[PDB]
Amino acid sequence: KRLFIIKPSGFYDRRFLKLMRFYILLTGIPVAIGITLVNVFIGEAELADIPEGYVPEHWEYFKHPISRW
Amino acid sequence: SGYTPDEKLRLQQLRELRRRWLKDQELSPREPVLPP
């Protein structure tokens, strides 16, 4: 003998959670994929001495490619 | 000294209504109509 359980309408909360997850993932999965691709294909720099008669650009003092960009 | 006749009548009518309402709370065999 199954009975009906009276509950508040959970459609709207579930829909909001689905929409928020969808938008965050839509904008974040490409970001994570690009970060991983950059990390495995364009590695960090190395601390090298400044060559004689050479003034580096201001962005050449950082090691992470994203930070340099 | 027990219920008064008006109290008995009101209690009986409310009892029949409540039992009917509880009977209406049951689920038919197809009630959870799950969409595909």
Ligand SMILES: CCCCCCCCCCCCCCCCCC(=O)OC[C@H](COP(=O)([O-])OCC(O)COP(=O)([O-])OC[C@@H](COC(=O)CCCCCCCCCCCCCCCCC)OC(=O)CCCCCCCCCCCCCCCCC)OC(=O)CCCCCCCCCCCCCCCCC
């Ligand atoms: C979700 C919705 C719900 C609502 C959300 C609400 C919140 C909203 C959030 C909004 C956005 C958040 C903002 C944050 C942005 C920050 C991004 C960032 O900077 O990345 C940081 C960081 C990247 O650092 P980096 O500076 O870019 O790289 C520096 C290195 O040079 C690089 O190192 P490398 O050169 O070695 O390269 C390694 C490379 C590759 O490494 C590997 O592949 C190797 C891995 C090992 C596997 C080896 C074996 C496998 C294969 C071998 C087997 C096959 C062959 C042999 C077969 C044998 C057969 C038996 O991997 C990577 O590149 C790092 C991963 C990149 C992920 C970046 C994330 C960005 C997300 C931004 C948007 C977020 C939106 C959400 C969506 C997120 C995605 C779903 O990423 C990480 O955090 C990595 C996690 C490391 C943690 C390790 C775990 C340790 C746990 C310790 C704590 C223990 C306590 C318990 C706690 C447990 C908790 C887990």
